[PDB]
DNA sequence: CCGCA
């Protein structure tokens, strides 16, 4: 035929993974814009989604919120399909300090960037493999909404492949520079005519120096700021991005959508706010604003067919989706934990009671508390009762020590950080379940409750004086989820057992 | 997490 996906993995889809793959692979072909996978912390997800890719045969973009997370999605995917195109398009700066300017302290910070080649390599390999074959999975960070050169001009200038994504022809360069001088003479009159003589001197000096640099030696530092003039697109243009280097029938998989979609949304507003101060003071031309990441409007506007993957799918996902695609049943047959809501009335005494019993049956406990000194005031309080305890303000080793048994309890505050799916954790205690907050949001609770779903004796305790709506939802949702899981195990004769794992040195 | 010496 041409190019197509070859799944590799020593297991078929079990759980309700098949049900989900069907419902998704369908909605895609059935011509559905958005789709939300509502899988449970500890189900198929990656395998489920790998299958949705290897049936529809589309070039896919996997967008993760953080890099560690992208590195695993890739790692796996570049092992799930060891004979296909799997790419890693993320930021390529070991260190980066954008050109800024603190107006109060009159502090112009300069641009300081430390490139990393190994990642730069992978970025070209992503954009170049995207034009060569039509079976490709690119695991991307949020840098995929940031600016890149027009994709026609990319391949429309190719022998074997360009070593830069922003390669502007020299008939253009000549015309562009003139357009820059012309903008400069305009801004300078505007500034100078509103009394901002100082700010016009700053601008004239920086821009003329760059303009010369360009004329002399084809480019200059901070060349980015002139990107639009160089691409000779009119003011206000929407940047070309990695999304544009994809076919029109490409797939988007936003992993951890409830945290990724917003991150991806916010980017633009942060950039503009800094650029605007530079523009306002003469550090830059107004056109520097057209060198930027996409607005979320522009991002959704470039989407072909997207699939939001989340245990706690956020508002946006649901609002623009035909219900969801639940994926509750775990291959292990494990259930969402059982939750108990108990008085704060001498809770710290009670909590020490339950933790004894966990140590007795060789089991671990995680505790979240709403504040940093509240936790410190617990860690000691548990040491008071002689209990091997930890605390989270190398770090991968303290959790590794937990699983091994150095510590019996691990106190924290945001247990939501990655690295806390210990299968040894039989108890998760949520202090201040009712005291409003982010970590006591309907979704934050549900995630934290999830930190009990690895162990077959998982149990959640919520310490509160009142039941909030938040509590009530997570509690009611978890109930429904355990009920469904428990009814499936009856049917398939499953007896849930903790997922066997170990740790290395 | 982002960023065209």
UniProtKB/Swiss-Prot annotation:
Gene Ontology process terms (BP): nucleotide-excision repair; SOS response
Residue span(s) of domain Helicase C-terminal: 347-505
CC cofactor: Mg(2+)
Gene Ontology CC: cytoplasm; excinuclease repair complex
Domain Helicase ATP-binding residues, every copy: 26-331
Pfam family, one: UVR
Residue sites binding ATP per the record: 39-46
SMART domains linked to this entry: DEXDc (SM00487), HELICc (SM00490)
HAMAP family listed in its UniProt record: UvrB
Free-text note on domains in this protein's UniProt record: The beta-hairpin motif is involved in DNA binding.
Protein name: UvrABC system protein B
Gene that encodes the chain: uvrB
């Amino acid at each position: 035929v041409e190019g197509r996906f070859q799944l590799v993995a020593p297991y078929e889809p079990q759980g309700d993974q098949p049900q989900a793959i069907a419902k998704l692979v369908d909605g895609l072909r059935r011509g559905v814009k958005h789709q939300t996978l509502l899988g449970a912390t500890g189900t198929g997800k990656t395998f489920t989604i790998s299958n949705v890719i290897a049936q529809v045969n589309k070039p896919t973009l996997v967008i993760a919120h953080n890099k560690t997370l992208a590195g695993q999605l890739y790692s796996e995917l570049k092992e799930f399909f060891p004979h296909n195109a799997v790419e890693y398009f993320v930021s390529y700066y070991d260190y980066y300090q954008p050109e800024a300017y603190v107006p109060q302290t009159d502090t112009y910070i300069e641009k300081d960037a430390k490139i990393n080649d190994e990642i730069d390599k992978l970025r070209h390999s992503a954009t170049s493999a995207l034009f060569e074959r039509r079976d490709v999975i690119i695991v991307a960070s949020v840098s995929c909404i940031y600016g890149l050169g027009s994709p026609e001009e990319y391949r429309e200038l190719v022998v074997i492949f360009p070593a830069s994504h922003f390669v502007t022809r020299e008939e253009k360069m000549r015309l562009a520079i003139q357009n820059i001088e012309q903008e400069l003479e305009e801004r300078l009159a505007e500034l100078r005519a509103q009394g901002k003589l100082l700010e016009a001197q700053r601008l004239e000096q920086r821009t003329r120096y760059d303009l010369e640099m360009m004329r002399e030696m084809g480019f200059c530092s901070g060349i980015e700021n002139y990107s639009r003039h160089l691409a000779l697109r009119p003011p206000g243009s929407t940047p070309y991005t990695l999304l544009d280097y994809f076919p029109d029938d490409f797939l988007i998989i936003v992993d951890e959508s409830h945290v990724t979609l917003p991150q991806l949304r916010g980017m633009y507003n942060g950039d503009r706010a800094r650029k605007q101060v530079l523009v306002d003071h003469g550090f830059r031309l107004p056109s520097a604003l057209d060198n930027r990441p996409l607005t979320f409007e522009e991002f959704e506007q470039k989407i072909n067919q997207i699939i939001y993957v989340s245990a706690t799918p956020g508002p946006y996902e649901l609002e623009h989706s035909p219900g969801v695609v639940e994926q509750i049943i775990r291959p292990t047959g494990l259930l969402d934990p059982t939750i108990d809501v108990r008085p704060t009335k001498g809770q710290i005494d009670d909590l020490i009671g339950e933790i004894r019993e966990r140590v007795e049956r060789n089991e671990r406990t995680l505790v979240t508390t709403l504040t940093k000194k509240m936790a410190e005031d617990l860690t000691d309080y548990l040491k008071e009762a002689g209990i091997k305890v930890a605390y989270l303000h190398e770090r991968i080793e303290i959790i590794r020590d937990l699983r091994l048994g150095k510590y019996d309890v691990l106190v924290g505050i945001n247990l939501l950080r990655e690295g806390l799916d210990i299968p040894e954790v039989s108890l998760v205690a949520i202090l201040d379940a009712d005291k409003e907050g982010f970590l006591r949001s309907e979704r934050s609770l549900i995630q934290t409750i999830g930190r009990a779903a690895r162990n077959a004796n998982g149990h959640v305790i919520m310490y509160a004086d009142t039941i909030t709506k938040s509590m009530e939802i997570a509690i009611q949702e978890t109930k429904r989820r355990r009920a469904i899981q428990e009814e499936y195990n009856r049917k398939h004769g499953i007896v849930p057992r903790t997922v066997k794992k170990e740790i290395r040195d």
